[PDB]
Amino acid sequence: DHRGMEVAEPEVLGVEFKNVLPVLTAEHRAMIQNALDGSIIENGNVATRDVDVFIGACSEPVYRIYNRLQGYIEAVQLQELRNSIGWLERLGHRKRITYS
Amino acid sequence: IKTTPYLEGDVLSSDSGPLLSVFALQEIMQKVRQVQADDVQKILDDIKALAAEQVYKIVKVPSISFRHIVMQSRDRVLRVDTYYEEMSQVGDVITEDEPEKFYSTIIKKVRFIRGKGSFILHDIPTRDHRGMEVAEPEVLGVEFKNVLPVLTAEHRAMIQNALDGSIIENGNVATRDVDVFIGACSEPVYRIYNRLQGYIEAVQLQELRNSIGWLERLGHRKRITYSQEVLTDFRRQDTIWVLALQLPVNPQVVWDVPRSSIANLIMNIATCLPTGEYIAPNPRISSITLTQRITTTGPFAILTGSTPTAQQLNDVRKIYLALMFPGQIILDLKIDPGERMDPAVRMVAGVVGHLLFTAGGRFTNLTQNMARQLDIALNDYLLYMYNTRVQVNYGPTGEPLDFQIGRNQYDCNVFRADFATGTGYNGWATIDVEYREPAPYVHAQRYIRYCGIDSRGIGMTYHCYNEMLRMLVAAGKDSEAAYFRSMLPFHMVRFARINQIINEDLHSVFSLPDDMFNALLPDLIAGAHQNADPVVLDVSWISLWFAFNRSFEPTHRNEMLEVAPLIESVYASELSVMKVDMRHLSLMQRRFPDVLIQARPSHFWKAVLNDSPEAVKAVMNLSHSHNFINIRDMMRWVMLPSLQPSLKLALEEEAWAAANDFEDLMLTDQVYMHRDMLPEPRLDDIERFRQEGFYYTNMLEAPPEIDRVVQYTYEIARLQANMGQFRAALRRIMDDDDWVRFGGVLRTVRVKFYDARPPDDVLQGLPFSYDTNERGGLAYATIKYATETTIFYLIYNVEFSNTPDSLVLINPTYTMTKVFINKRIVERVRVGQILAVLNRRFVAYKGKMRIMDITQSLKMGTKLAAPTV
């Protein structure tokens, strides 16, 4: 936390800039620190649930798969889960199986 | 009265065990602990302690507000107000990025000033002098014991005359009631004392009359014995009444708190639910031989004659607990994936559950899944041809109980669960909830009548049980039909006792309001809970059968049943006080956006809940652990107008008004830095320097000029620290002989006294911390803009062995921190003006007068008080 606003720690974002820090001059280092200070965290609603949203760095092919996985997560929550649970209940009903 | 024996592993026992009021709390706490998985007496006595609350204290002598310090001189002394001395250490260190600590410190300071400001004088010491009555010096708010052994005869006589002049203006008046004398007292506590007094002289006889009337109306419903006496309106000439609490508590105050359903349920079950004992339909069955208990074959024959284990008694207790609370406790089945059982027990449990429980129509006691499992078990039992065979016709659909059985075609589809109409259970074709006449609690006026029976047991039946018997007879299950028929009186007695307990004992403000009670079932059908959350308890299969046979006998009533209204009023008043405190915090955030770091409703709630009665803290923590809260709920709650008037509320408002000026709270932003010289005076004449009383401190008696001072800000300081030029900039500005103001945030201030040279860390202390020696390679240099600052006073002690130039140092020594508070916390006062502090007016009672609290007298409502006319 900082000034009442949550700020992401320097390890969550996908960069490895710590090795070049010891040689950097003071005035560029201050700009780097200010850029770190700008990593504030907002809120967003997903599947009627609030989640933390922030900006980072990632490669395009990995980001594509990450976005696809996220979209699948939102897509499933609509109808598929309820139908699957209902079918499981019916199967337990027929096969004399009692589930918790 | 003792329970029927139960088996403990291999030995029979009949101990009652823990009280039902204690068992329930443990189960609820265990379920809550299971919620956040990813001591009961300690709480029960904590609620019980709320019946002996006090918010004032009768004191013999007021606390001393001033004291004097000797500086090795007899001409003048220092006058120190101990109010700020005690005030500076109330809170902890205030940081620049922890609002929770800041608000908690503010709340603790307000509570401390309220507690210090409330006191009542009973009987002051006094002494006669020359025919006049003079109060003794001990009752005064100043102490000067060490002052006397140094003053001369002239000043001693002067101060003796000053003491002897403290005459009680009405002392010579005969047969008087109270006495008044002039005294000295700090303004912040004098305001609270005056407010308490002003509340005192306001007579409230009508309030007591109304409270007694409401107590009688409550005792009407609680079946309290009627005392032969009728209360009279009298006032003794030697008594003064005080009434801290008003009895007719408003239910909106307690039911407006968000996510308070679990809290209210726990409080109600702690304060009203009585203990009991369990009895089998036939006594002393442990004495009879097993052969007389097992007579035939079938699932019921196997079930009959078996003795319950000790563990299953707990599940029976859970089932009964759910029985007393219809819509707040719900059952579910415990199924272990790696367990098994004789199917006869499942069959019997399925048969019993339909008669034992209710579901649909108005309310439910069991979840939809449990209803489905019970229906499946009943279906399996009905298609169990263990003794005889009958024809059956199956239905087109595959749903359970969709068939016709017996020579006479009986439709079993009516026994399938349906929460819309409740055909399959005790809610079938019967009405159980009704309204008769206004209740003592306006929020809850409903009546509960299980099976339609009322107290205002042979032959009474109900539709569901008759249909059960008809279907059992049609299905050819003749053997168990007689067993069920013989059980009716026991069943009806048990349910009559349950209705009696529900309608008569569990009535309180914590009972669920009618609207939310009616809204539970549609909410459960919808699936998305709103404004109410039930709690689910888990039971086993055999528990249903063992509960169907064991009754509940209320051997003892709840011990705390007599004192429910007092704790109810205390809880409501505490909630109102918390709401008012949070509103004041919101106003404080509104007034000062430029000096207060930030605002957050969640931090407000956490800070106000941090300092609270422990029982309330634990109950609210459990309630908010079960269900979560958000900012919207806090915003909705901080605006509702409902409040519960009391002495606590008035005292809190007066304390807030007195503490509006934050300088009284020992918080100051006027912290300055300037290089100053530590004085070293000449010692040409030791006695001449001694008699003038020299002393030094970092205090500023006047603010510096508007110019020559630079105004610093947290953002500017942070930027300079990140540049690394902070130290150089401050060094240059101090070499420029200019002042600097470290404003923008409140800092904790402490007071210290010294006679020798103070420790270096104090004299050379800094208002901030700046560290530049680190190998972290991150955050660069860390700056802490807000740190603790200390007030120090120095008293110079000189001995005759000191040379005139003994205090001259080779090189100058500097001091940095200065601060202005605009209040004379420490004064240099001559001996002639010591007694001028006595300016406040005090009023006290006499020994003949007796003061007592009427609240303890309205312990229970047993006395009628004349016709209302």
What's CA B615's distance to the chain center, in Å? 5
Q: What's the CA gap between A64 and A58, in Å, rounded?
A: 10
Interchain pair B777, A33: CB under 8 A: no
Elucidation technique: cryo-EM
Q: In whole angstroms, how far apart are CA A46 and each of A12, A83, B684, B703? A: 21, 21, 83, 56
Q: Which residue of A has its CA nearest to B376?
A: A93
Interchain pair B335, A2: CB under 8 A: no
Q: What's the CA gap between B240 and B201, in Å, rounded?
A: 9
Residues 6+ apart with CB under 8 A from A99: A88, A89, A92, B335
Q: Is A81 on the interface with B (CB under 8 A)?
A: no
Residue B122 dihedral angles phi and psi, to the nearest 5°: -100, -55
Contacts of A81 in chain B (CB under 8 A): none
Q: Which residue of A has its CA nearest to B332?
A: A100
Interchain pair A30, B335: CB under 8 A: no
- In 3D space, the residue among B62, B80, B86 whose CA is nearest the CA of residue B147 turns out to be B80
- The token pair at B621 is 């923590």
In the beta sheet, which residues pair with residue A50? A45
Interchain pair A18, B337: CB under 8 A: no
Contacts of B99 in chain A (CB under 8 A): 4
For B692, the enclosing helix (H) or strand (E) is: none
- For tokens 């026994």, the residue is B415
Q: Which of B600, B719, B780 to mutate to test the interface with A (most CBs of A within 10 A)?
A: B780
How would you label B767-796 residue by residue, b for 16+ Cβ within 10 Å and e otherwise?
bbebeeeeeeeeebeebebbbebbbbbbbb
Tell me which amino acid residue B848 is. Answer: K
Q: Is B597 on the interface with A (CB under 8 A)?
A: yes
* Percent of chain B as helix, strand, coil, to the nearest 5: 40, 15, 45
Q: Is A3 on the interface with B (CB under 8 A)?
A: yes
Helix axes B647-658, B187-200, angle to 10 degrees: 150
Kindly state the DSSP code that residue B51 receives in the 8-state scheme.
G
Interchain pair A3, B723: CB under 8 A: no
Q: Which residue of A has its CA nearest to B721?
A: A30
Q: Which residue of B has its CA nearest to A24?
A: B777
Contacts of A30 in chain B (CB under 8 A): 722-723, 780
Interchain pair B97, A34: CB under 8 A: no
Q: What's the CA gap between B778 and A90, in Å, rounded?
A: 59
Q: Is A26 on the interface with B (CB under 8 A)?
A: yes
Sort B400 into a burial class: Cβ within 10 Å, 0-12 / 13-18 / 19+. Answer: buried
Contacts of A29 in chain B (CB under 8 A): 780
CB B299 within 8 A of CB B382: no
Q: Which residue of B has its CA nearest to A48?
A: B528
Tell me which amino acid residue B290 is. Answer: L
Q: Is B41 on the interface with A (CB under 8 A)?
A: no
How far separated are the first and last CA of chain B, in Å rounded? 47
CB B802 within 8 A of CB B683: yes
Chain A: closest CA distance from residue B579 (Å) = 23
CB atoms closer than 10 angstroms to residue B384: 15
Q: In whole angstroms, how far apart are CA B683 and each of B73, B534, B697? A: 16, 83, 20
Q: What's the CA gap between B712 and B718, in Å, rounded?
A: 10
- In 3D space, the residue among B461, B54, B495, B36 whose CA is nearest the CA of residue B244 turns out to be B54
How would you label B651-668 residue by residue, b for 16+ Cβ within 10 Å and e otherwise?
bbebbbebbeebebbbbb
Residues 6+ apart with CB under 8 A from A97: A91
State the DSSP string of B83-98: HHHHHTTSS-PPPSS-
Q: Provide the 3-class DSSP secondary structure of residue B409.
A: coil
Q: Are strands B789-795 and B747-754 parallel, antiparallel or unpaired?
A: parallel
Helices (H), ranges, B364-441: 368-382
Contacts of A99 in chain B (CB under 8 A): 335
Q: Indicate the residue of B335, B723, B778 with minimum beta-carbon distance to A100.
A: B335
Interchain pair A18, B597: CB under 8 A: no
Q: Indicate the residue of B598, B777, B780 with minimum beta-carbon distance to A4.
A: B598
Interchain pair B778, A99: CB under 8 A: no
Q: What's the CA gap between B733 and B740, in Å, rounded?
A: 8
Q: Indicate the residue of B97, B376, B722 with minimum beta-carbon distance to A3.
A: B97
Q: Which residue of A has its CA nearest to B774?
A: A22
- In 3D space, the residue among B711, B709, B712, B734 whose CA is nearest the CA of residue B721 turns out to be B712
Q: Is B598 on the interface with A (CB under 8 A)?
A: yes
Chain A: closest CA distance from residue B105 (Å) = 18
CB B573 within 8 A of CB B91: no
- For tokens 């007496």, the residue is B41
Three-state helix/strand/coil letters over B629-673: CCHHHHHHHCCCCCCCCEHHHHHHHHHHHHCCCHHHHCEECCEEE
Q: Indicate the residue of B337, B597, B722 with minimum beta-carbon distance to A4.
A: B597
CB atoms closer than 10 angstroms to residue B520: 21
Helix axes A26-37, B714-723, angle to 10 degrees: 140
Q: Provide the 3-class DSSP secondary structure of residue B867.
A: coil
Chain A: closest CA distance from residue B367 (Å) = 13
Interchain pair B722, A30: CB under 8 A: yes
- In 3D space, the residue among B535, B395, B349 whose CA is nearest the CA of residue A98 turns out to be B349
Q: Which of B719, B722, B782 to mutate to test the interface with A (most CBs of A within 10 A)?
A: B722
- For tokens 């199924």, the residue is B335
What angle (nearest 5°) sits at the alpha carbon of residue B470, between those of residues B469 and B476?
Answer: 90
Contacts of B778 in chain A (CB under 8 A): 10, 18, 21
Helix axes B40-48, B20-35, angle to 10 degrees: 120
Q: Indicate the residue of A2, A29, A33 with minimum beta-carbon distance to B97.
A: A2
Q: What's the CA gap between B462 and B859, in Å, rounded?
A: 43
State the DSSP string of B467-527: HHHHHHHHTT-HHHHHHHHTTHHHHHHHHHHHHHHHHHTS-STTSPPHHHHHHHHHHHHH-
CB B748 within 8 A of CB B667: yes
Q: Are strands B671-677 and B739-742 parallel, antiparallel or unpaired?
A: antiparallel
Helix axes B478-485, B463-474, angle to 10 degrees: 160
Q: What's the CA gap between B293 and B301, in Å, rounded?
A: 8
Interchain pair A33, B335: CB under 8 A: no
Q: Which residue of B has its CA nearest to A31?
A: B722
- In 3D space, the residue among B785, B740, B789, B786 whose CA is nearest the CA of residue B763 turns out to be B789
Q: What's the CA gap between B78 and B346, in Å, rounded?
A: 87
Three-state helix/strand/coil letters over B703-724: CCCCCCEEEECHHHHHHHHHHC
- In 3D space, the residue among B207, B214, B192, B209 whose CA is nearest the CA of residue B243 turns out to be B207
Residue B33 dihedral angles phi and psi, to the nearest 5°: -60, -40
Contacts of A21 in chain B (CB under 8 A): 777-778
B 723-742 residues with CB < 8 A to A: 723-724
Contacts of B337 in chain A (CB under 8 A): 100
Q: Is A28 on the interface with B (CB under 8 A)?
A: no
Q: What's the CA gap between B635 and B755, in Å, rounded?
A: 53
Q: In whole angstroms, how far apart are CA B245 and each of B501, B580, B648, B858, B860? A: 29, 17, 9, 10, 14
Interchain pair A2, B722: CB under 8 A: no
Three-state helix/strand/coil letters over chain A: CECCECECCCCCCCCCHHHCHHHCCHHHHHHHHHHHHCCECEEEECCCCEEEECCCCCCHHHHHHHHHHHHHHHHHCCCHHHHHHHHHHHHHHHCCCCCC
Contacts of B724 in chain A (CB under 8 A): 26
Is the Cα torsion angle B500, B502, B504, B505 positive or negative in sign?
positive
Q: Give strand ranges (E) for B738-847.
A: 739-742, 747-754, 769-771, 782-784, 789-795, 814-819, 826-830, 840-844
How would you label B446-474 residue by residue, b for 16+ Cβ within 10 Å and e otherwise?
bebbbbbbeeeeeeeebebbebbeebbeb
Residues 6+ apart with CB under 8 A from B412: B382, B401, B402, B403, B404, B405, B471
